[PDB]
Symmetry: D5
Subunit: 154 residues, 10 copies
């Protein structure tokens, strides 16, 4: 059959510089995600002296923070952490839609991959069930995408 | 285990200049938000003469006002206040979605943080229960993101 | 304590452009009638108003773009009505027409009053037509003066 | 008030019209084009001034319409096609994205783009609207093309 | 009645195609890739002119596709993957955003991007569409690559 | 063509005895409905000495009241008035569904027509727009259905 | 593999049919009645054996149909009418309750009741279904009357 | 214009005997309702020894308990208390719909009014804001419908 | 704990089974019955102990099933058919009512009634489930019939 | 001040019947295991428990009806799980199974614990299975003693 050139994913974090932005709304979720995220990054070989962590009040403030960090081009990839948890109103949909749209835009316009670790759930229990796993996944996504972006960069 | 560099959030509002745009639809809600917002800003050290306040008819008119103020680059951070309360038709979704989108886009394209304090609720009672708290929250958001923006500049 | 810019409703000397979508034409006509009446109440000269019409709400965006780009108008107004039928097209037209109106205002600096109703029944549109038209005139006059206020 | 009113202009003589037809649910798009071409000729659009291109589906409309609008050889463009709901959320995705691309093209290039993409739940709904919609898009293109020149 | 009709061109000879496969629900993306590659070869695309990349999830498709489109080494791109509803609103977010990014890349770079990301409620739905959607994307990338060349 | 026997509607209220049950939740709506209902009944010829009016707190209490009145068989028809107005919760659907189901059941099981004048709306404005018209319609429905039930009774 | 199969019987000779027509959105119920009566006659139902009653709305169908079923003068009943969505949740209430009453009467009296009450969002939908549903109800009442007799 | 006979509602609770069934799911809510309900009943003249109170695990178990009490015909009226708070799944609709339906059917088939004081809300905060008020409302409903039932008997 | 466990019994020997097939979307109901009869014979149900009746639509199921259950000639009944969503709310009405009638019959007569009425959005969904569902209803009827006797 | 009947959890001497639906069998088995374990903790003798199984949630109603009608049980328990798939059948089975359980309890006076999960994902069912089974045992024991308390 057809056999094209397949770029193999690269999960080696050695030498990578990673920036993390953590929303503090429903802060216990952000904390659990960050803990699991750092643990995984170190497991992938990311030096702890090469990781910066910043926090913002809520998920709507992620975009402006991530935008500045990507503009500096000091980071091979960024990570957004936080949790939008549904309350009583339509504001759940507004914050979920807008935070994701900002994250997606930053990666597209600056070339810096941004892992989206922002949960958008109905209950505190759903956020707790996903916090630790989501943090670790974001660490793997940031390492893999930093390396893929480098591979596609001349 | 791992221990990276942590930027501790800074809420010192001394010397900041803040701009506020308040939509007047369901005016009582925006008024309660604005009173709480100014009261909180003073609590964080923002000078009275360091704050400008503007008002627009509705939430859809916010975007153009916030844009003009941010482009001047006279403000470290901005705040949008107001309330969209559902009526009988899909217009509630239209105004809620568009107002929020304009706020987010302004902060992204100018680098000036914009706290989104526009409620999007089904009933007047829900808006009442959230007005004062949200206005205070936006003051803390603008001061903190203003400091964070400069640190990253 | 702080600086407060007071709303300015003096429409004297303002140049206002209005774009009316003709779908469900009865609604747009009632809005335009109430809108022109209101503008004159604010002091807008009849000679300072240009009115154009387009087939539907999706055609509003391209029309308002050209008019705002000329910068011959201090503010614009969009009139019309999307009324739900049998299919999802209602959401599409409501979402997109609003997004275009919002985008033009942000990108050109010229305020655009959104007078496009997004309703389920003819009756809902009829109940809101005359009001919304007058509201748009007040929004355009206030936001037009407002825009000049923040400029040099 | 008798403000300056730009009367809509439906004279198609001398206009260059481009058409992009999505072929998913092909019967619908073909009925739309058959009615569209009939109407354009009725309004005076020369057969030699119309080009017709086709694409597999509604999501491919944006790239094709963008290239033709960028050539600035066309006074206005027309998008034909039909999204018909199936079993999954992809119906909302294709409906939203195709309309957003059409709108964005018209705002950014100044070339009006008639939106003749139906977004329906059933084959029957698409069949009821196809021929009427195609004719409607022809009238939207001629009117908006003449309108764009007036403001240019 | 008798205008210029551009005929679709499905000849894949000489074309260079880039493919990005989201690995979430990996079996689906892999089945799509098999049918896509087999169909590209059926259409005459040389295996030496196809590059394949993979990413963790559909939200990472944008940054990968954007980089490939920027290089301008490819006549068309293909996005493969599957969003499958779980328990939360994250399904809508990933469906909406991935589609919006794919659409945006094609419009702003001129490189057609076939959108083969499924957005379904069940695993069974994704499986039923996997192979058919992969081959459809092969035909879409070839046809639109040839169409883009025609309007250049 | 086919020409069957068509029973002509009869709107003569003379000699009819009508019972009304008014829910007081969002009381201004019930009041407007009752006023318009009485006016219309008198216009149809219903003697005011032949009409009884009772009220209950809310629409969920309509069923038990209407059930007793229908059981006495002192009434040729009954009328339910009131308004369920949506608030913040699913209780709007529960009260709307259940009040209508009770009204419908009473008519089916006792043979006494029950006009359903209970509005189920999203806003106070929608209830106000419909109060007076709905009250009058219920008066016409009770008169017509009392007469139709008599016609079908041997 | 080879069981007892009861064949449907559409012979309307000798049958007595009762019809209740809700008059809300009256044009719809009247169009249903015309097609229903014409189809009953086509099926052999004698006009002298059909009684027609009308009621204000679909919620009054239950009490009228219940009285007719109690008399046991009819081999089958037919309910005609149309619920058309307005602005509020009352559309669901009347759709649900009228259908539930019709269904309940047939189960507890043994008299089949054809349910020809439409529950639609637009006037156009009701019009498109009116005549077809009326005749369908004629065939349903005749066939089920004959089936009910078979199992007695 | 027209002037028919008007039965003025009567809220005299003297001599009434009331039965209450309280579901314990989200127990704090039912407790606040029950405290308000008993307090209101005394305000309307119901004797302490004239009230029986029973509790069941959840709202679905109400129906069987309310039925047994109503069939005894020892009570002039009954009250159902509790709260269904939405979680992650469709079970919220199932319990809300079925619990309410059982309450309505009991009042219809026995002639004993049953006040429905079972909240059906999305959040714990909504249940909290409504507990005390609803419990008081149910006391007034049971007393008034109890008097109305006897007047029509 | 080893409580008394009644083992499900699937021996169809000696059972009398009644079947009612709605004919709306007839291809579906016929595929359901073809699989159903195959399975019943597999479990040992004699061909001479099965009667098959048909009705126009799912709303007519309740009256027919009620009469057959009331005869007490059948150990269990089977309802076949398919409601396929169209353009309006009538899909929810027919789905809800048909299922409620089937359930009510089984509770009130003690005759188990297998519910093999599909409630789907598309023709394709009905075709995917028809044959499997028909076989499933055969096994439900035999097991529940034997189960009813054990508790009788 | 008033009379308060205290909940009684002493299960000694109670006779409990359990009906387990086998659809998504893993869930029902985990519920039954946790339920039997809990019942013994309350003092229910193993010899006083009968357990029966049915194919699906819709078959629960007829089974519980026969068991409650014998009055050999102080309370019953229904176990099982409805898990959403691709179609509306999820709502139908969830609504009807609950309605039957509620109706049996009201009409026979015997409490019935509703242990039927109505969830969207397998994971939601797995997270709730063991819990709900134990909860049902406490509900049946408490409500069984409760039912005797209100009787002579
Ligand atoms: C209801 C709400 N929920 C969340 C949430 O779940 N997660 C989150 O990060 N932020 C939430 N917010 C606040 C907005 O994200 C934002 O910080 C404010 O509107 C201030 O601009 C709000 C208002
Ligand atoms: C119906 C409506 N509702 C609100 C609302 O709830 N909150 C708000 O801030 N503004 C509302 N508006 C006004 C629109 O945002 C806008 O001002 C007009 O559509 C055009 O000026 C309108 C028109
Ligand atoms: C169905 C429809 N409805 C409306 C409406 O309710 N309000 C409105 O202003 N326009 C409507 N249109 C027309 C579209 O806006 C547009 O003109 C067509 O899609 C053709 O480009 C259409 C096609
Ligand atoms: C399922 C589907 N449905 C439609 C439709 O109803 N209308 C339409 O115009 N196109 C449809 N498509 C095709 C997509 O727009 C597109 O071609 C694919 O996602 C591949 O890029 C698809 C794939
Ligand atoms: C919940 C989820 N579901 C899917 C899915 O169904 N299909 C898919 O392709 N990707 C999914 N993702 C992953 C996001 O696209 C993304 O990788 C994460 O948010 C990490 O950035 C997530 C997070
Ligand atoms: C929210 C609510 N709304 C209404 C309403 O709009 N109309 C009405 O008549 N009653 C309402 N209720 C109360 C219930 O109908 C009922 O009276 C209580 O639950 C007491 O049993 C409630 C709880
Ligand atoms: C709003 C409404 N809509 C309809 C409809 O669309 N079709 C119909 O047949 N009946 C409707 N009704 C009337 C109710 O069935 C009923 O007559 C009133 O509630 C008076 O009892 C009402 C009230
Ligand atoms: C999830 C759940 N939620 C509630 C609730 O919000 N309110 C309530 O009163 N009961 C709840 N229940 C319990 C059920 O009503 C019932 O007790 C079980 O399904 C069977 O005993 C359950 C199981
Ligand atoms: C539109 C429609 N759809 C279906 C369907 O999808 N499945 C089905 O079994 N029956 C359908 N019916 C027929 C109705 O059940 C019924 O026969 C009519 O309302 C006339 O009584 C109708 C009328
Ligand atoms: C699709 C389906 N899903 C479930 C489910 O999730 N849980 C359950 O208990 N039963 C299910 N069933 C089976 C029905 O309850 C029933 O057995 C069939 O409709 C055959 O009568 C069916 C058919
Ligand atoms: Cl984007
Ligand atoms: Cl999980
Ligand atoms: Cl944005
Ligand atoms: Cl800007
Ligand atoms: Cl940017
Ligand atoms: Cl509301
Ligand atoms: Cl709150
Ligand atoms: Cl915008
Ligand atoms: Cl209004
Ligand atoms: Cl622009
Ligand atoms: Cl049409
Ligand atoms: Cl290559
Ligand atoms: Cl785009
Ligand atoms: Cl780009
Ligand atoms: Cl462009
Ligand atoms: Cl398929
Ligand atoms: Cl009923
Ligand atoms: Cl009205
Ligand atoms: Cl006769
Ligand atoms: Cl029924
Ligand atoms: Cl009856
Ligand atoms: Cl029966
Ligand atoms: Cl049709
Ligand atoms: Cl009831
Ligand atoms: Cl009872
Ligand atoms: Cl009764
Ligand atoms: Cl919630
Ligand atoms: Cl409240
Ligand atoms: Cl029973
Ligand atoms: Cl399947
Ligand atoms: Cl019940
Ligand atoms: Cl849980």
């Amino acid at each position: 059959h057809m056999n094209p050139y397949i770029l193999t994913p690269d999960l080696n974090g050695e030498g990578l510089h990673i920036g993390i932005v953590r929303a503090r709304f429903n802060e216990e979720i952000g904390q659990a995600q960050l803990q699991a995220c750092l643990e995984e990054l170190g497991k992938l070989g990311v030096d702890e002296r090469d990781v910066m962590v910043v926090s913002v009040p809520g998920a709507l403030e992620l975009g402006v923070a991530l935008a500045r960090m990507a503009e500096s081009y000091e980071f091979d990839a960024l990570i957004a952490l936080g949790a939008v948890i549904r309350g009583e109103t339509y504001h759940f949909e507004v914050v979920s839609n807008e935070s994701a749209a900002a994250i997606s835009r930053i990666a597209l316009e600056t070339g810096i991959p941004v892992a989206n670790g922002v949960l958008t759930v109905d209950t505190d229990e759903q956020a707790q069930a996903r916090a630790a796993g989501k943090g670790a996944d974001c660490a793997q996504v940031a390492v893999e995408m930093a390396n893929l972006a480098a591979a596609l960069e001349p």
